[PDB]
Write a structure and sequence with these properties.
Helix content of chain A: over 70%
Strand content of chain A: under 5%
Entry title: Human lamin A coil 2B fragment
PDB class: structural protein
Distance between the termini of chain A: 84 Å
Assembly: dimeric
Oligomer: homodimer
Number of helices of chain A: 1
Largest interface: A-B, 16 and 15 residues
Structural class of chain A: mainly alpha
Shape of chain A: rod-shaped
Chains A, B: lamin-A/C
Radius of gyration of chain A: 25 Å
Number of domains of chain A: 1
Number of strands of chain A: 0
Keywords: structural protein, intermediate filaments, nuclear membrane, left-handed coiled coil, right-handed coiled coil
């Protein structure tokens, strides 16, 4: 009755939180890929700065 | 010489962290929007279902 109501409520919301969990996971993955790209870009600009200064004098 | 180099490095990394925080902020807004859609769907599904069963029997 209310046990049935509470069970159905628990299941429906757990299905909803699965779906949300997948989305966070997909989005986290995309953020991680973006982070890597920026990290590499910063590393490269630092390598370029240093290599520039090397060949100054 | 090293004061400037260390300073620009701090700002560059700080900018990268800012770009990532803003990107996370934009992830959340999309998740939040998706969540809201899911809420409305569950609400309408529960409504349809109530009609289909609780006013057909």
């Amino acid at each position: 009755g209310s046990a049935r109501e509470r069970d159905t409520s628990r299941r429906l919301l757990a299905e909803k939180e699965r779906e949300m969990a997948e989305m966070r996971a997909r989005m986290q993955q995309q953020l991680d890929e973006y982070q890597e790209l920026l990290d590499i870009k910063l590393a490269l600009d630092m390598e370029i700065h240093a290599y520039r200064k090397l060949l100054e004098g």
